[PDB]
């Protein structure tokens, strides 16, 4: 496997707060389509990597999801966190500016200056999000199935038919969310898909922002987010049981899975 990157994992080394890989970040200088972003990338990880684009919330910044730029980039993939244009943007323009930061990572990778110079393989994309960010990521997915994985969190979007995503998808979802109720949102959103592999993970008694920055369940979650996008983005067959199992934890209240190897 030519994707193949860093040591053969362990729970442990998946729950940790970091991974293998030495992680520097910088300000996107010139953002173009979307507010703002962050990108996190390895120092050491001996081979270009996939890169993922990870939005906000409604009103929300890039502080609630920027806790996944550090961890997923430490186990070896290129990670744009963003801003959106305004805080009150929709799904659509979400991932409208999440495709927009891909394209800008793509940029980035091909120019001399910039500390991902040659880093990034532009072939292996992944989205993430939180809220309106995860629907925006879902609709990224339905329309872009050349992405290898999606892994949206405590998702919100008006339309819960995703029935086109053939794209690997495990949703986060957070048991007593008031804004983006499961029942109403993920559950229904996960109900649609039935052409991809995918997954559903509800976090015990978590509120809204049960997967966000300075969550208590860095532990498991980190380790399902890294775990999905190694198998599926990197096609790491290592990270099989760790991305398809369920974790038979306290801290999960519901767990889901379909058409996962």
Same mark, same amino acid.
């Not at 495709?99 to 800008?104: C, D, I, K, Y």
């Not at 086109?164 to 109720?181: G, K, R």
């Not at 559903?200 to 978590?206: A, T, V």
């Given at each position: 496997? @030519?994707?193949?990157? #860093?040591?053969?994992? =362990?729970?442990?080394?998946?729950?940790?707060?970091?991974?293998?890989?030495?992680?520097?970040?910088? =300000?996107?200088?010139? @953002?173009?389509?979307?507010?703002?972003?962050?990108?996190?990338? @390895?120092?050491? !990880?001996?081979?270009?990597?996939?890169?993922? !684009? &990870?939005?906000?919330?409604?009103?929300?910044?890039?502080?609630?999801?920027?806790?996944?730029? @550090?961890? $997923?980039?430490?186990?070896?993939?290129?990670?744009? =966190?963003?801003?959106?244009?305004?805080? $009150?943007?929709? +799904?659509?323009?979400?991932?409208?500016?999440?495709?927009?930061? $891909?394209?800008?990572?793509?940029?980035?990778?091909? =120019?001399?200056?910039?500390?991902?110079?040659?880093?990034?393989?532009?072939?292996?994309?992944?989205?993430?999000?939180? !809220?309106?960010? #995860?629907?925006?990521?879902? &609709?990224?997915?339905?329309?872009?199935?050349?992405?290898?994985?999606?892994?949206?969190?405590? +998702?919100?979007?008006?339309?819960?038919?995703?029935?086109?995503?053939?794209?690997?998808?495990?949703?986060?979802?957070?048991?007593?969310?008031?804004?983006?109720?499961?029942?109403?949102?993920?559950? +229904? &959103?996960?109900?649609?898909?039935?052409?991809?592999?995918?997954?559903?993970?509800?976090?015990?008694?978590?509120?809204?922002?049960?997967?966000?920055? #300075?969550?208590?369940?860095?532990?498991?979650?980190?380790?399902?987010?890294?775990?999905?996008?190694?198998?599926?983005?990197?096609?790491?067959?290592?990270?099989?049981?760790?991305?398809?199992?369920?974790?038979?934890?306290?801290?999960?209240?519901?767990?889901?899975? !379909?058409?996962?190897?």
């Amino acid at each position: 496997n @030519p994707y193949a990157r #860093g040591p053969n994992p =362990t729970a442990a080394s998946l729950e940790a707060s970091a991974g293998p890989f030495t992680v520097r970040s910088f =300000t996107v200088s010139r @953002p173009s389509g979307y507010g703002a972003g962050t990108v996190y990338y @390895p120092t050491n !990880a001996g081979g270009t990597v996939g890169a993922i !684009a &990870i939005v906000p919330g409604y009103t929300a910044r890039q502080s609630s999801i920027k806790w996944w730029g @550090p961890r $997923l980039a430490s186990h070896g993939f290129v990670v744009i =966190t963003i801003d959106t244009n305004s805080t $009150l943007d929709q +799904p659509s323009s979400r991932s409208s500016q999440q495709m927009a930061a $891909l394209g800008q990572v793509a940029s980035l990778n091909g =120019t001399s200056s910039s500390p991902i110079y040659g880093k990034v393989d532009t072939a292996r994309m992944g989205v993430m999000g939180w !809220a309106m960010g #995860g629907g925006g990521s879902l &609709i990224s997915a339905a329309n872009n199935p050349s992405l290898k994985a999606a892994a949206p969190q405590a +998702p919100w979007d008006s339309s819960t038919n995703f029935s086109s995503v053939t794209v690997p998808t495990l949703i986060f979802a957070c048991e007593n969310d008031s804004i983006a109720p499961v029942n109403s949102h993920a559950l +229904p &959103i996960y109900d649609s898909m039935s052409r991809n592999a995918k997954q559903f993970l509800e976090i015990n008694g978590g509120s809204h922002s049960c997967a966000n920055s #300075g969550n208590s369940n860095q532990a498991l979650i980190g380790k399902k987010g890294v775990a999905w996008m190694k198998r599926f983005m990197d096609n790491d067959t290592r990270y099989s049981t760790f991305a398809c199992e369920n974790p038979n934890s306290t801290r999960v209240s519901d767990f889901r899975t !379909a058409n996962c190897s």
